Write a new protein. Structure first.
Lengths: 221, 203, 221, 203, 221, 203, 221, 203, 221
């Protein structure tokens, strides 16, 4: 990982090209909550659909979706879990999610600084409530953090960022904004495909996560 | 310090004092020695305060990380085995505690763990300095066919009978009942002191 | 191991090309059990057929088949055994097989991150029962884990995944699903070859593994 | 603590107490001190509880990993030699235990291992604090031409004769018989207490 | 040591090309025993023929022949001796020879994984009796282990594997199977050369090795 | 413990007790304290059991690896020098043993090695707690012009004369005769107890 | 140091090309002794001829001559001296010279295994008596050991190995075999050069080395 | 232990006992405490046996490697300075010895070295437990104008006068004479005991 | 630093090319002494001529001149001083100068063995008296030591070695041999240059060094 003569890091943009092959995923803030949606592309009858996990929890108040190389995604989800538990042991409670995202993105930055390692080919979304409130974050393979209101990652990123650029009234209730997000996920596809059941998780201030079962998912579909 | 764990049919009742002393001297009349380390699992600490609180933070972290990585709660024998390995890898710079781990995986369990990591399961256990008075009550009054109401009244009788013959035990009493239906439910203050006032005891 | 300009890891796909030369192996879930079958291609009279081991146990409740470079396969089987015994010493019992597969695949991922090492050229299948039930997993040289119901690895992978895509009714008994799997292993071959005795292992909830002797193997053949 | 190992013609009988104390005080009336570490091999622990349980977890792991890597069970002299190397590589921060390893590879073996890793094979051995009373019974009543029935009745006589002259021994008795035909078979509770009731003893 | 685009390790096949220049050596199982034969090509009058060692013992019950680069062969024979004595110190007796072969072949595998080292250019044969019985093994520069009944290594490998493929009735006595093996070693040569005295070692269950002196060797010749 | 080494013309006779105690208490009436560490070389251990057995495993490994690497047996002075370096590189966490190394390289040798690695060759040596009684017999009866038969009868007289005035020595006696012709030959049980019965002694 | 596509180590043969520029040296076994001769090519009046050392002692019973790069030769002679004294401290006496040669040649092998180091460009001859008797060894830059009866190293190697192939009756006395060796060293040269005084050392069982002074050297010349 | 070094005109005479004890008990009546560490240099050990023998092996190695690397023998002051640095780099886990180094480089030297590496040259020195009796003889009879014959007879008188008033000294006496002409010459047994028989002494 | 296909180390000969740009320096043995002369080429008025040091002492009995890269020369002079004081602390006196030269040249050899370092571009001359007598040594960037009677290093090496090859009667007194050496240093130059005052140091057995002041230097000039 060295500089290009116009000031770019080639392994980082090639890592972003590895991100653009992943699954489409959304994050969206509710009036008093947040939301994560992931495109669950079922590929065969032979895979356990009940045990595949797209939204996987860092904490009861913090979840995260991933896109890119799924092995690096599993590694950074495990690192985010261990870092969250270190902050709970040291201080007593997870006050700020932004510093969990900074402790992930400092390692993701660290592999774009040193030679002998390649960058992570993943992009993540961290959603959940804390002492400031319902918060949504996005992390980029250079270790770049941005705080959003509604974002998307994966192959169908620009269709969903365009759709939510037109759409997304700010303070929506839960069911209407889940309907909006699944309309965004329909807008990312083609007409040669239809949505099989996505995976949806939501949180409201005061509660833990409620990962939706397939009745609410097909009912919203 | 006086800590009790009782295994009923489908419940675990764990109750504790709330007094922290320094060799004659009641430094804090209101401590916290009964903790919920997992959804269906509670820990009760005794011995040195500073080591016990650090063991509580480690066990909350390790049990919650286990639950996230495996989507099922840890079995209670694995909680006591994990904590036995943690206490016994040191053993010569040891943690000066003694601990109760009680919970429900399929059947109710109460494990008692000493300062060198010897975990032994028993149908009722008691740690602290006022443990022999609790053992005196629980030898003559404990029957494993009791309900949860007679269980809670029993543990209040045992700890209230150890508050009067031990000077290092006192204060309000913390009772926590663990079932499969509701889980870890810590009983409120006014219910417990209504049971103390109703049995004819001194708080 | 660095990124290609379109976001690929060339050493990982070359490792998968090293996987496509291995032996064909199947994994299949029974109604209340799981199943591993491996193509035992006997090559001469001079090799001890009684001591060659394709299905080799990680644990009495966990077995695994391999494909690819057989030396790397032996190394990762030994690592899986040592990691299983570390989880038995630490906790007391092997509650979850998925975390054994994650502790193997975190090392297999780890060699595709660092320079100075090459990736493992193996793909594995982990089968066995635990506190959740009869479980089947597949691990890919990038460290990619998927939970299946019936899968195959090796040279004849796509013929068996195609055959079990048409076939494989879900809750079968033991003998009928062993017959189905050995029909899949017949469907992978050519007509210039015939199956010499495969190696078959099965487990049912409550019991340990039953590695079949050659009477049941030739009888099912 | 009172632990017995008896080598018969083609059987090993290993039996134990079930009482865990703290210097006068019966902390647990129901422990577990007799373990099956391999298919044909049993271990009986004595001494400190916390070190002994960790040695049990290590020996179950190492024996099972040996069995998977080599497809044959470990010989008993290699079990006692392995455990002697484990106990003796420390020796100055030692495990405060004493252990019995009994099993069958081709002939029955009973090895007795102390806290510094000195493994000695003998035809009968006994560890714990009530070991001399067991040695008193086994000097005058042990004959190596007994059957398994007279062996089990002998070990029940020895441990029941050490429960009455040792205060650190008591509770129900755990007998485990190891043969080649069935292997490690731990005798049920009602069979053993039927033998205690039938020989005229106190449980 | 990295992967070729068709999934091969070039340094390992070049190491096998370094193996194909070594001396021809045989291993053969007796009815109740095993056997090692090595082609002792005497090259001058000036070399001590009495002190050159082809069959050299790992243990009184375990011997091994080598082929390839003789320096790497001496290094791996010393490593096999030290590993055998570690298993005798730890456990008490050398129960299994297969795990000695696995502890050699895990190091030979280890140098084909890491950069900064080259693979060993040797192939070995491990013969000897243990608690399972008379056992014969072969180890390949990738660290590949196979258990045989009769094998050969070196330059004249394929002539001897072909000859023993036609020949080698299974349960032979000692003298007849030594005659068979030295006929194989005659079959590997040309007619422009003749066998000078080979080196032969044998073991039978219950005994230690009997390295043949030149009377029995010339008598069998 | 009572261990004897005798250097004759072309033989080394090394003999030992078979009793393992714990400070008054005969834990094992049948031990093993006389080992063959090489083809022509025997070692006899005394002192702590656990350290001595580990020294036996190290010396069997190092002598056998020496024999494979060099095709000749190790000279006895190099065995005692090697073992002196092993015992003396520690010296402050020491092995609590004392050892005899006896063998034949060109002439018979007996080396006596203490717990800090001081190897001294002598024509006869004796270690253990009943060593002074052996020294009492061997001052008045040892002549270096004896045969092997009178040598074996002498060592049986010395150890049998130390079994009666030392409480930490007893049991069956292990005699091992090392010659160039046959090597390390341990004499059978019935031959030795026939010599004990024939000299008028108590076993 | 990696493998060539035909299984050779190029840095090792280039190291042997660095050996072929050294001085010619002989080793020869006497009836009850051994012998080392080295070609002392005096190059100017300005060099101290009395202090140049070709045969330099590892021990009073072990000497060694070298050829190749003289700095690497000095390093390996110092390593052989330190290893000899470690064997004298550990055991008490230097019983076997073959294991001293193996402890030198395991390091010389070790630098042809690892990257980051180059091989030693030296070849050595180890001569001397021990508990087996008068022994002669040769060590090759790959770490290759052979036990000889009469060998030579350096630039004029093949002329002396050819001459001693024709000559060298086995059990010669001292003076006759020194005359034979110095006739070999005359046979290696051209007629444009003549032998200036070589350096000769000899040992007989029971004694230490006797490095010849110039009276015996010119007298034998 | 009784060790003497005497510096004459062009000779060094070093002589020693041959008895190894254990606090009252003559374990070995025939030891070796006088060593030749170099061609013209001898060392005489005293104190603990195991540390002293290891120092002998180190000094033989370092002096011989020095002689090979530099083609000249080490000067005696550099031998004692080297050994002082070896003994003094430890100093707190020390070697419990005291040593004599005597030799010839251009003039004869005798250096006496204690357990912390303090090397002092003197014209005569003596170490061991029977050193004050030797100092008693050498104060009244030593003259630096003696020959080698009167020197050897003097050291035999001194050590024989320390064998009778020290219980830790005895046995045969080892005398070694170091000159430039022949070097280190250890005198034979029959010559020394002929001098003992000729002076009217007891061996 | 690797081998050339004809057995040469290219970085070492390039280091010798870096040596051939240094100043000319002489070493010469007296009847009962030694001598070092160095060409002090004064380059400007602005440099302190009184503080430039060519002959710089390792010890009161050991001096050394250098040629090549002056920074590496300063580093190896400091290493020679520290090694001399380690031998004085360990033993008590500096008995042998040859082992000081070997401890310098083992490091200079060590950097031509390992990759990651370049060789020293210096050549040194070590002169001085010790327990053997007046001794003179030369050290070459491969770590090559030769003991001379009169040598030279630097750019004008071959003119001085040629001149002292014709000249240099052996046992000369001090003043006559200083005159001979400064005639050699005149013979190395051209006629377009003249000797500005060289730097001369001498030692006689029993004394320390006497570095000549400019009266004796201009007087000998």
């Amino acid at each position: 990982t060295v500089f290009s003569p116009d000031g770019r890091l080639f392994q980082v943009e090639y890592a972003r090209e590895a991100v653009k092959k992943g699954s489409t995923a959304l994050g969206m803030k509710f009036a008093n909550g947040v939301l994560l949606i992931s495109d669950k592309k079922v590929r065969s009858r032979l895979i356990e659909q009940n045990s595949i996990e797209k939204i996987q929890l860092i904490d009861d108040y913090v979840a995260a979706v991933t896109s890119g190389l799924v092995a690096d995604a599993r590694v950074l989800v495990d690192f985010a879990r261990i870092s969250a538990q270190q902050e709970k042991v040291t201080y007593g409670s997870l006050v700020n999610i932004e510093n969990l995202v900074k402790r992930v993105a400092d390692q993701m930055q660290q592999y774009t600084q040193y030679g002998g390692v390649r960058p992570y080919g993943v992009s993540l979304i961290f959603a959940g409530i804390d002492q400031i409130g319902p918060r949504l974050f996005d992390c980029d393979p250079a270790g770049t953090i941005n705080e959003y209101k509604a974002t998307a990652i994966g192959s169908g990123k620009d269709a969903v960022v365009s759709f939510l650029e037109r759409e997304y009234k700010e303070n929506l209730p839960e069911k209407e904004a889940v309907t909006l997000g699944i309309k965004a996920l329909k807008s990312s596809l083609e007409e040669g495909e239809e949505l099989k059941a996505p995976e949806i998780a939501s949180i409201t201030v005061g509660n833990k996560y409620r990962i939706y079962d397939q009745e609410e998912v097909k009912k919203f579909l | 310090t006086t800590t009790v764990g009782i295994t009923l049919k489908d419940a675990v009742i764990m109750a504790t004092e709330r007094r922290v002393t320094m060799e004659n001297f009641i430094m804090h009349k209101n401590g916290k020695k009964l903790f919920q380390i997992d959804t269906y699992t509670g820990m009760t600490i005794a011995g040195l305060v500073g080591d016990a609180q650090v063991l509580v933070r480690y066990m909350k972290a390790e049990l919650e990380l286990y639950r996230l990585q495996r989507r099922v709660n840890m079995p209670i024998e694995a909680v006591a085995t994990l904590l036995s390995n943690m206490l016994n890898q040191v053993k010569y710079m040891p943690y000066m505690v003694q601990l109760l781990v009680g919970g429900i995986d399929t059947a109710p369990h109460v494990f008692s763990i000493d300062a060198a990591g010897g975990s032994v399961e028993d149908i009722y256990a008691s740690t602290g300095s006022g443990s022999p008075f609790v053992y005196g009550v629980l030898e003559s009054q404990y029957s494993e066919k009791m309900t949860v109401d007679e269980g809670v009244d029993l543990v209040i009788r045992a700890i209230s009978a150890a508050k009067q013959r031990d000077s290092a035990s006192g204060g309000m009493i913390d009772v926590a009942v663990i079932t499969r239906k509701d889980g870890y439910v810590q009983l409120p203050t006014d219910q417990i002191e209504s049971r103390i006032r109703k049995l004819g005891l001194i708080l």
